[PDB]
Amino acid sequence: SLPASAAKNAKLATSAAFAKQAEGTTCNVGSIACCNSPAETNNDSLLSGLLGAGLLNGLSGNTGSACAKASLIDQLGLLALVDHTEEGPVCKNIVACCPEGTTNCVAVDNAGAGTKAE
C-alpha cells in the first residue's frame, strides 16, 4: 500500500471495458464519472451526501442522477452508480463527465444506457 510509486496510470484499478467506454464516450480523464438512475443513486439518504465528498453536484439540468468520479471511487466507492463485471469496475447505467469541486456533470449518452465495447 504505497500511493504513487512508479504508477503512471490512474484508471479504475483496471477499467479495460471502462477504458473502451472512456474512448467511445467524449469525456475527460480527471472528470470521468458514472451516473445512475436517481432513485438508486439517491436510494440511501446518506448516499446522496456520500457521493458529494467534495460538495459536488449532479447531472447538468437533472438533479437526481449524480455522478461519482474515479477519484471518488478510490475515496469511498459509491456502489450506487458502479457495477462490477469480470471486465472490471464499470458503469452501472449512465456515462457522463463530471468535475471534482462544484458544478453539474455533462452527459454525452442519455439514451445509450452507457454501453461499452466489451
Swiss-Prot record:
Superkingdom of the source species: Eukaryota
Annotated glycosylation sites: N43
GO molecular function: structural constituent of cell wall
Gene Ontology CC annotations of this record: extracellular region; fungal-type cell wall; spore wall
Classification via PROSITE patterns: HYDROPHOBIN (PS00956)
Disulfide bonds, paired cysteine numbers: C27-C97, C34-C91, C35-C67, C98-C105
Biotechnology: Hydrophobins such as dewA can be functionalized for use on orthopaedic implant surfaces by producing surfaces enhancing the adhesion of human cells such as mesenchymal stem cells (MSCs), osteoblasts, fibroblasts and chondrocytes. Improved cell adhesion potential of human cells on these surfaces is not coupled with enhanced bacterial adhesion and therefore does not introduce increased risk of bacterial infection.
Inducers of expression: Expressed after 12 to 24 hours post induction of asexual development, which correlates with the development of metulae and phialides. Not expressed in hyphae and strongly induced during development.
Chief site of localization: secreted
GO biological process, one term: asexual spore wall assembly
InterPro entries: Hydrophobin, Hydrophobin_CS
Effect of inactivating the gene: Lowers the spore wall hydrophobicity.
Quaternary structure annotation from Swiss-Prot or TrEMBL: Forms homodimers at high concentrations, and these dimers are off-pathway to rodlet formation. Dissociation of the dimers into monomers, with resultant exposure of the hydrophobic face, is necessary for self-assembly to form functional amyloid fibrils called rodlets. Self-assembly into fibrillar rodlets occurs spontaneously at hydrophobic:hydrophilic interfaces and the rodlets further associate laterally to form amphipathic monolayers.
Function recorded in the entry: Aerial growth, conidiation, and dispersal of filamentous fungi in the environment rely upon a capability of their secreting small amphipathic proteins called hydrophobins (HPBs) with low sequence identity. Class I can self-assemble into an outermost layer of rodlet bundles on aerial cell surfaces, conferring cellular hydrophobicity that supports fungal growth, development and dispersal; whereas Class II form highly ordered films at water-air interfaces through intermolecular interactions but contribute nothing to the rodlet structure.
Family (UniProt): Belongs to the fungal hydrophobin family.
Protein's name in the database: Class I hydrophobin dewA
Species for this entry: Emericella nidulans (strain FGSC A4 / ATCC 38163 / CBS 112.46 / NRRL 194 / M139) (Aspergillus nidulans)
Organism placement in taxonomy: Eukaryota, Fungi, Dikarya, Ascomycota, Pezizomycotina
